[PDB]
Structures are given as structure tokens and as C-alpha cells.
Write a protein that binds this ligand. Structure first.
Ligand SMILES: Nc1nc2c(ncn2[C@@H]2O[C@H](COP(=O)(O)OP(=O)(O)O)[C@@H](O)[C@H]2O)c(=O)[nH]1
Ligand SMILES: [Mg+2]
Ligand SMILES: [Mg+2]
Ligand SMILES: [Mg+2]
Ligand SMILES: [Mg+2]
Ligand SMILES: [Mg+2]
Ligand SMILES: [Mg+2]
Ligand SMILES: [Mg+2]
Ligand SMILES: [Mg+2]
Ligand SMILES: [Mg+2]
Ligand SMILES: [Mg+2]
Ligand SMILES: [Mg+2]
Ligand SMILES: [Mg+2]
Ligand SMILES: [Mg+2]
Ligand SMILES: [Mg+2]
Ligand SMILES: [Mg+2]
Ligand SMILES: [Mg+2]
Ligand SMILES: [Mg+2]
Ligand SMILES: [Mg+2]
Ligand SMILES: [Mg+2]
Ligand SMILES: [Mg+2]
Ligand SMILES: [Mg+2]
Ligand SMILES: [Mg+2]
Ligand SMILES: [Mg+2]
Ligand SMILES: [Mg+2]
Ligand SMILES: [Mg+2]
Ligand SMILES: [Mg+2]
Ligand SMILES: [Mg+2]
Ligand SMILES: [Mg+2]
Ligand SMILES: [Mg+2]
Ligand SMILES: [Mg+2]
Ligand SMILES: [Zn+2]
Lengths: 117, 135, 38, 472
RNA sequence: UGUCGGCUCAUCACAUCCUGGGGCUGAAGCCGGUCCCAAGGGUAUGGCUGUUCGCCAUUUAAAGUGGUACGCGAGCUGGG
RNA sequence: GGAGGUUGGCUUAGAAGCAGCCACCCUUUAAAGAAAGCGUAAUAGCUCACUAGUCGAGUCGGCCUGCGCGGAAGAUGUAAC
């Protein structure tokens, strides 16, 4: 399994991206096939949107630089951090139509300039 | 639904297409022309896969995914049979210029971030054949 | 059922149990892995 | 006015449907029914085995055929064997689901199961009609009787009434004929196959004496000198010397044609005499049938097309042999041997019949046949058969079996096959053979012995043992 | 302290031949293979040979394996 | 959830992770073996390895050692304190 050295290694990668990221959203991924997720990651990669999946207990540790601290109340159940690197917002239109068609995830919540939304 | 691998323009009723006549009965002579409708594109012979989506009765659909990245390396490297033992019994040779095009002709159906990664996909497939890649 | 003196698991689903002072192997996957004595 | 044959799987309704249809509107072999859309007749004995035997004699005593399946337990292997027997002859197939009078009343698996046999229905592709009927309940006579004619849409002319006598024989009890062309006024001299006579008795199906024979109607003639075969042909002559001369010419020509067939129709004479080589497959298991079918479906394009016309699982029943004879085909037994009647048909006629054990061997042989460069007389020979009569297995080494050795010599220097129901089960070598508990090492012909085979003890009462040598 | 075989009469063990109850099966059915529990009751007639045995012929649900001074001559025989 | 190059190359009538031989890379990833098993004539189909959730405090295996348990069936009657 994972090790303690790697556990604090993976929080930095989330912490490094979250330091400069502007718009971030949280979503679930249960029920959607890994085939249907290659298309989404293709769309985000074309639009400069960074999508990742981390442990809930590591997300709270990673999100500490006063970036998206207003999200630590909905780190329950599966998570998928989708931070927007350019054109703040961005990774919400992709999630807007993907949720409709695929019939999966409630897109949890979203954060923007300390707004829980 | 049903899928297979047929040649580049013949697709005649034959052991390439044996159970299309049993999957839903299906007028298979119709599918033969339909496959021939997109014709050769690379002259007959080069195997090309299909995804035949079958519906109520014998409704068709037809995509022609690509041309598999095994006949392509044999063509660009001369011989038409790969090694019976890689590591030692090398059979061919290629260069990072051929690998650029053979990936650029499969930029669909590789799901690789940038094309630099799409090459390392192909060279990994070469190293099982017996080819050796270099400049 | 197979009666031996050396009873032991044959796959993942096998199960060593002791019932009325006899060692037995019961397997949900294959009914051929049942064993007694041992 | 076609000539219908009922045809289907056992215990599915053929005799029931025939008897019902006859009852709505004394067994000789044929019967006929008059309906406002037009008179239609049927032949008494159903099943492919009887329909193809007479066809194997140029008779073509059929126009339309109907499959009866059941809503429960639908397409069964003999159903698809029948549809093979009907396509090979070549007649449109009109289907009918019979047992719709049951709780299991879903003609939905029947349609899409029988469709993967080139009997595709109308709502699917438009090729062959489908109809629910029920002989027990009765609901379905109308639709079937309309469809039997609506699917008789060739010109269907000829059968010119005023014409010389021309019919085909059916039941050689005394006989009957279902005339194709002409009229058969009683008293006229007749040539019925290799046979001569005059019409004294002209009984009908119901037995009412008549004197006029319809265009496509049955009638039982009595007065002939004896009994002809079951698929021969009858016409009208005037001179007894003419009848005898024609009979002797027919004798000679038949004795010539049997030799010509047994010569040119061999696998060895394929390329010389297109021509679309026909094969007739029989395999031990369904997998080794499907694989080898798909292998021989494509072999050569611009010269000769090889198309399999049969294909079943089990021994080589005589229906298979008659089909191969009628279609001028080549038998093939992959791990299955022939019955008695198959041997009878094989010996009388030609019809090359060769056995095999390796999938590759049949492909190799057909390649060399299509190129005409095949060798002759290869792949082993039969040097002895024994029939197992009793199996006793002592609890020290239990494998011994009593055998009556029939027509050959069984030894220890040759490997064997053991076979049940004309299907092989095991191919190994001898372990022991001993008479009077004494280990003799050579058993004669017609003798009796005790055989035990190495690393196989399952022989039963009623098997057979063949011993063979890979001779080259 | 009379030694083979036959006859008459038996008695016990179970490492069960049949009948009885089960597990697995390369157990579809009818048949089987193998292992477990079970000793209540049954468990051939003849041809050859002094034979036990054996091989044959025809049966039977089956024609069990052993201990008892290789049971049994103050119970018989006397072929070896 | 357990994927894409990909029926990896050879062989083979057919060898598609799963007859046999050689390799055993790469891509998107939280993770997914050029596959541990069942299946097909070859496919198809079903599990596993692995990872993300849920549940909140113990859990997993080996070494030394005391006493026990199976392996363990006989002939007159318990009958090997
Ligand atoms: N329930 C039901 N039984 C039928 C029907 N038709 C026939 N049967 C029964 O199915 C059997 C068919 O046997 P049959 O056709 O005469 O034998 P075959 O000639 O060898 O096919 C008969 O015993 C009938 O009683 C039907 O429509 N419904
Ligand atoms: Mg034991
Ligand atoms: Mg108990
Ligand atoms: Mg039935
Ligand atoms: Mg006692
Ligand atoms: Mg016991
Ligand atoms: Mg017993
Ligand atoms: Mg018993
Ligand atoms: Mg029992
Ligand atoms: Mg049993
Ligand atoms: Mg006892
Ligand atoms: Mg007793
Ligand atoms: Mg007793
Ligand atoms: Mg009692
Ligand atoms: Mg005796
Ligand atoms: Mg004597
Ligand atoms: Mg003794
Ligand atoms: Mg004794
Ligand atoms: Mg004594
Ligand atoms: Mg004794
Ligand atoms: Mg005494
Ligand atoms: Mg005495
Ligand atoms: Mg004495
Ligand atoms: Mg005394
Ligand atoms: Mg005395
Ligand atoms: Mg006395
Ligand atoms: Mg004397
Ligand atoms: Mg004496
Ligand atoms: Mg201990
Ligand atoms: Mg002990
Ligand atoms: Mg006792
Ligand atoms: Zn098990």
C-alpha cells in the first residue's frame, strides 16, 4: 500500500497547485467508467483545467494555504478536485454538460474568492 | 455490439466475416458493400477494425477505427514477419522520423498528452516486435 | 468428500474448521475441496 | 396446385398438423385438399429423410415445404438439418410455429433464432413468411393455407392437361403415383420405371374408383407386374417390346452411370471434371464442426468455390448420404463413422466417403483436390474390428472386456480407436489381450478374446474397437 | 501332541460380495468409478483332476476375505 | 471502477491476458498484470491482483516452549488402570 513518506509527498502536489490556482470545484466519480473519464480529462487538458483525485483526509491537510479553506465541510465521500489554471471558472462549463449526459456526481460544491456557493 | 478485423477493401463473405450471418441473421452482402463504400484508402490488404452496432433486426453502423500499429511497423521496416524472439534476434530498424508519422496517423485512438508521449507508445510496441529504434 | 491424514487448503475459498473434534475443510468455490480427518 | 411436404423435428406436430388438415376437408402415401384459392396437395410421410431419397433419383417430387417448430423448445438440431435439406434441394421454406397452444407461447426466440439460418422473416428482412398455427387448438389453418399459395408465386404454368402420361412413383406396396403432366385413363399401357403394365385398378385416396387422373393429383394404380422402387418415373408406352427394350437400355445405362459417378465424383478427380465442389460435413462435437466449417467456407476464388451443403453432429445417417448423393457431394467424417444404411447407400452408389482425425488434414486434402494434384490412398487403413460383449473389472486391475472379433485381426502392434454410436471416444494403444487367461498376442478373425486398453477403463456393453496402422 | 483333500456340524473378525444410508465425479438419463457409515440376514450346480487352487459350461441379488491345532479321524472316509 | 496502443511478436486450421516459445514496454490515471483463475473451436462472458469511498481501534504472521488432538482396522467375552 501507500507509505507515510509518500503520503506527505502527495499533499504537496495538491498544495503546490492549490497555491496558485484560482477557481476550484469538487465532484464525485462513482459509477462513471474509466473510459468515459478519458474524454473528460482530454477536454480539461485542452482547456488548461487541472483535475485530480485525492483522499479526503489528505485534501484537508493539503488545502491549508488559505486558498479553498471554505471547502473542508464537504470532504465527505469521494472527491475530485478540479482547479482552473486559466480563465477563472473554465472547469465549470465542462462539468455543466458532463453531469447532465453521464448521470453521475452532484458536483458537490465550488469555491471562488472564499465563496462556498 | 460485434467487432472484427477485415482487409482494406475486400470484406467478402468469408471466414473474415463468418458470424455476421449468425449474430442477427443480417443481409451480410449489404455490409460488404457498405464496408467497400469507404473503399481501400490504403489499397486492399491492410487490416482495418470495425465496430458494427446492431439494432432491432439488422440496423448497421460503421466507423473503421484505424489501421493497427503492427502492420505499420512491418511496412516501414521492410520485413513482413516480426521476431520469433526479441532481445537478440532483431529483425528490422526504424527512426524517430518514421515514428512521428505512424503516430500522426493514429493521433486518433491514442489518448496521449502531446505527441511526444504518443511516440513512446509506439516505440514500446516496436520493442516487442524485434525492431530497434534510433535516430 | 476426501478423507486423508494431511488436510489443507487447496485455493483461496477453502476454510479450515474444527467440528466435534475433527479438522475439516469446507470450500464455497469448488465442492471438490471438501476434506475430513487430518 | 403445388405439392407440399411437411417437415420438422420429432414430436413437434408434423403428423398432427397433416392429420388435422386432412380431417377438416386409408393410408396410401399422398392426399389432397380443395380450397377456394386453389387445390393443394400433401405427401403422407413427413421428414427430410423421405423427401430427399426420391430427390436423389432426379424425381424433384416437391414444390413447397413447411417447417413446423414449437413455441416452447424451438429450433432443435434436426430442425436446422431439415432446413439444410430444403435449401440444398432448393424450394422456398414456409414456416409455422405449432405449439402456440401452450403457456410458453413466445414466438420471439423462434424468430431471431431461426433467423440466423438464412430463413430471415419478413419484418426482419423480407425473405420467408412466418405464421402462428396450432393443430390442437385449430387457430391458424386459414393463414397457413393462404400463405402456402401466396408463396407459390412462380409462373406455375405447364401441367398441360391433355398430354402423354408423366408421373412419379411414391409408395411401392400395387403402387401410387402423383402425376406431374398428362392424364392416366385406365386401361392404357404404362412404363413405370423399369417395369411394364396396364391400368386395371385406379383407386383414389378415399378409395372411390375413378378413371381420370388430374394434373397434380394422386392415384394408386394396381395391375402392374410387381413393385418398382420409390422414386422412379412413369410414362405411357404402346408396345410391350418397346417397354422391354427401354427397360434393358435403362439397365445398361444405370450400370454405366453408377461407374461414371463412382469415377468422376471422387475427391481425386476434382479439378478435371468452377463446378463448385460440394462437401457434406459430419463432426463429433459442435466446436470441431464450426471451426472446420469456417475454415472451408473460403478456399479459392477464381477457380472452384467450396461450399458446404450439410453439416451435423453424430454418425453418418443415411439421410446425410442421400443428400450427398443428390447434390453430387463429398462426404466427410471427422471422428465419426457410418451406420449400416449409410454403408448400404455408399456401397450401392459411389459418393466418396473418407474419414479423418486432424482438422488440418481436411484442409490439406481440399487444397490438393482443388489444384488437382492430390495423392491417392493415404492416411491409414482398417485392419480389424471387435465388438465388446461384456465388461468385467476385478478390483486388482479392472479394465478387461470380452470381445467378439468381427471381420479382421486385432493385434498388439497397432493402435486403436474405441467408438460408441459410430462416434469415437478414445484413441490409444493396447495394454492386454488374453484368451483363457493366457496372454496370446495375436487374435484371428471371427475369434473371441479379452481386451484391455492402457490408461482408459470405461468400455461398456455395446461398443466397438477398431485397430489401424498409419500406412504410407 | 495322528500331518493333504472330501463329508457332517459349525463359531467369530471386518480389511463389505449382495441387500441398506451417504459425499465427490472427467455424475445428462440407464449404467458406472472412488471414498465414508453399516456385520441384521443371505452368499451356486456340474466337466477335468487325489486335489485346495485353477480353467471351462450354465446360473445368481451376490456366488466376500480371513482366524478357529492351515476348526472338526475317542464324528465318518482313505483318493494323495 | 478494474481502461487505451493491442487480436504485443512468433506459431497455429484457429491462439484475441489465459494450447506452446520470446519478451514483458508505453499512455490516461486514484488504480488496473502485455494477466492469478473459471470459461470459448477462436471470440464472447465471470472473478482476482490494484485503487477511491464507508466503517473508528486495534490488527497480521513468524520463532522458542509445557500439556493435549487426528493419523489409530481382528478374530470365544468388556478385555491395552
Ligand atoms: N399442447 C399441444 N400439443 C400438441 C399440439 N400439436 C401436437 N401436439 C402433441 O404433440 C405431439 C406431436 O406428435 P407428432 O407430431 O404426431 O409426432 P411427429 O410426427 O414425429 O412429429 C402429439 O402427441 C400431440 O398430442 C399443440 O398445438 N398443442
Ligand atoms: Mg487416514
Ligand atoms: Mg454429528
Ligand atoms: Mg422434451
Ligand atoms: Mg471375539
Ligand atoms: Mg468399515
Ligand atoms: Mg459389500
Ligand atoms: Mg452398501
Ligand atoms: Mg449407494
Ligand atoms: Mg456412490
Ligand atoms: Mg462379520
Ligand atoms: Mg452376525
Ligand atoms: Mg454373515
Ligand atoms: Mg432390529
Ligand atoms: Mg468346481
Ligand atoms: Mg477324478
Ligand atoms: Mg494360518
Ligand atoms: Mg485357517
Ligand atoms: Mg487342520
Ligand atoms: Mg480354514
Ligand atoms: Mg478330535
Ligand atoms: Mg474316519
Ligand atoms: Mg481328514
Ligand atoms: Mg480325541
Ligand atoms: Mg481314532
Ligand atoms: Mg467312533
Ligand atoms: Mg482303497
Ligand atoms: Mg492309497
Ligand atoms: Mg504449543
Ligand atoms: Mg497421539
Ligand atoms: Mg467385542
Ligand atoms: Zn477450495
Amino acid at each position: 500500500a501507500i507509505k507515510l513518506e509518500d503520503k506527505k509527498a502527495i499533499v504537496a502536489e495538491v498544495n503546490e497547485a492549490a497555491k496558485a490556482a484560482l477557481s476550484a470545484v469538487v465532484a464525485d466519480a462513482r459509477g462513471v467508467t474509466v473510459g468515459a473519464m478519458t474524454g473528460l480529462r482530454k477536454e480539461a487538458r485542452e482547456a488548461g483545467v487541472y483535475v485530480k483525485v485525492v483522499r479526503n483526509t489528505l485534501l484537508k491537510r493539503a488545502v491549508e494555504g488559505t486558498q479553498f479553506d471554505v471547502l473542508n465541510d464537504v470532504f465527505k465521500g469521494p472527491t475530485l478536485i478540479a482547479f482552473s489554471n486559466e480563465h477563472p471558472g473554465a472547469a465549470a462549463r465542462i462539468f455543466r454538460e458532463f453531469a447532465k449526459g453521464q448521470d453521475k456526481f452532484e458536483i458537490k460544491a465550488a469555491a471562488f474568492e472564499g465563496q462556498f456557493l | 455490439y460485434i467487432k472484427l478485423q477485415v482487409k482494406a477493401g475486400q470484406a467478402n463473405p468469408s471466414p473474415p466475416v463468418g458470424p455476421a450471418l449468425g449474430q442477427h441473421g443480417v443481409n451480410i452482402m449489404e455490409f460488404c458493400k457498405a464496408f467497400n463504400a469507404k473503399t481501400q484508402g490504403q489499397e486492399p490488404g491492410l487490416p482495418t477494425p470495425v465496430i458494427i452496432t446492431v439494432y432491432s433486426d439488422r440496423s448497421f453502423t460503421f466507423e473503421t477505427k484505424s489501421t493497427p500499429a503492427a502492420v505499420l511497423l512491418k511496412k516501414a521496416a521492410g520485413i513482413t514477419s516480426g521476431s520469433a524472439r526479441p532481445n537478440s534476434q532483431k529483425v528490422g530498424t526504424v527512426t524517430r522520423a518514421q515514428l512521428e508519422e505512424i503516430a500522426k496517423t493514429k493521433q486518433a485512438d491514442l489518448t496521449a498528452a502531446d505527441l511526444d508521449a504518443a511516440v513512446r507508445t509506439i516505440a514500446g510496441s516496436a520493442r516487442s516486435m524485434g525492431l530497434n529504434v534510433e535516430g | 468428500m476426501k478423507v486423508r491424514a494431511s488436510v489443507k487448503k487447496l485455493c483461496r475459498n477453502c476454510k479450515i474448521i474444527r467440528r466435534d473434534g475433527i479438522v475439516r475443510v469446507i470450500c464455497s468455490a469448488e465442492p471438490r475441496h471438501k476434506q475430513r480427518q487430518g | 396446385a403445388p405439392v407440399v411436404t411437411v417437415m420438422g423435428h420429432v414430436d413437434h406436430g408434423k403428423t398432427s398438423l397433416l392429420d388435422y388438415i386432412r380431417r377438416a376437408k386409408q393410408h396410401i402415401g399422398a392426399y389432397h385438399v380443395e380450397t377456394e384459392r386453389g387445390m393443394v396437395t400433401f405427401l403422407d410421410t413427413p421428414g427430410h429423410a423421405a423427401f430427399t431419397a426420391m430427390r436423389a433419383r432426379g424425381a424433384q417430387a416437391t414444390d413447397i415445404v413447411i417447417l413446423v417448430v414449437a413455441a416452447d423448445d424451438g429450433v432443435m438440431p434436426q430442425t436446422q438439418e431439415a432446413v439444410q435439406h430444403a435449401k440444398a434441394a432448393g424450394v422456398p421454406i414456409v414456416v409455422a410455429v405449432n405449439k402456440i397452444d401452450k403457456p410458453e407461447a413466445n414466438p420471439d426466440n423462434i424468430k431471431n433464432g431461426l433467423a440466423a439460418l438464412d430463413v430471415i422473416p419478413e419484418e426482419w428482412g423480407g425473405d420467408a413468411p412466418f405464421v402462428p398455427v396450432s393443430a390442437k387448438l385449430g387457430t391458424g389453418v386459414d393463414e397457413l393455407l393462404e400463405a402456402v399459395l401466396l408463396q407459390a408465386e412462380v409462373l406455375e404454368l405447364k401441367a398441360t392437361p391433355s398430354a402423354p402420361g408423366r408421373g412419379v412413383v411414391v409408395e411401392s406396396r400395387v403402387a401410387t403415383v402423383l402425376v406431374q403432366d398428362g392424364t392416366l385413363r385406365q386401361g392404357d399401357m404404362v412404363l413405370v420405371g423399369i417395369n411394364y403394365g396396364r391400368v386395371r385398378a385406379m383407386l383414389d385416396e378415399n378409395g372411390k374408383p375413378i378413371k381420370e387422373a388430374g394434373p397434380s393429383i394422386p392415384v394408386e394404380i394396381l395391375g402392374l407386374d410387381g413393385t418398382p422402387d420409390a422414386g422412379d418415373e412413369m410414362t405411357v408406352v404402346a408396345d410391350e417390346k418397346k417397354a422391354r427394350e427401354v427397360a434393358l437400355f435403362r439397365q445398361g445405362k444405370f450400370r454405366e452411370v453408377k461407374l461414371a459417378r463412382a469415377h468422376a465424383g471422387k475427391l481425386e478427380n476434382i479439378f478435371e471434371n468452377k463446378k463448385t465442389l460440394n462437401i457434406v460435413l459430419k463432426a463429433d462435437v459442435r466446436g470441431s464442426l464450426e471451426a472446420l466449417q469456417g475454415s472451408l467456407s473460403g478456399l479459392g476464388n477464381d477457380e472452384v468455390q467450396v461450399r458446404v451443403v450439410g453439416g451435423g453432429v453424430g454418425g453418418i445417417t443415411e439421410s446425410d448420404a442421400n443428400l450427398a448423393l443428390a447434390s453430387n457431394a463429398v462426404l466427410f467424417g471427422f471422428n465419426v463413422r457410418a451406420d449400416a444404411g449409410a454403408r448400404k447407400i455408399v456401397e450401392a452408389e459411389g459418393l466418396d466417403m473418407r474419414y479423418y482425425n486432424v482438422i488440418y488434414d481436411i484442409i490439406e486434402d481440399v487444397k490438393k483436390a482443388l489444384t488437382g494434384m492430390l495423392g491417392s490412398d493415404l492416411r491409414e487403413n482398417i485392419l480389424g474390428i471387435a465388438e465388446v460383449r461384456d465388461v468385467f473389472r476385478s478390483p486388482k486391475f479392472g479394465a478387461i472386456a470380452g470381445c467378439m472379433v468381427t471381420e479382421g485381426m486385432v493385434h498388439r502392434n497397432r493402435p486403436i480407436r474405441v467408438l460408441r454410436d459410430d462416434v469415437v471416444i478414445f484413441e490409444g494403444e493396447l495394454e492386454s489381450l488374453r484368451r483363457f487367461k493366457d496372454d496370446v498376442a495375436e487374435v484371428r478373425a471371427g475369434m473371441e478374446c479379452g481386451i484391455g486398453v492402457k490408461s482408459y477403463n470405461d468400455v461398456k456393453v455395446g461398443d466397438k474397437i477398431e485397430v489401424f496402422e498409419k500406412v504410407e
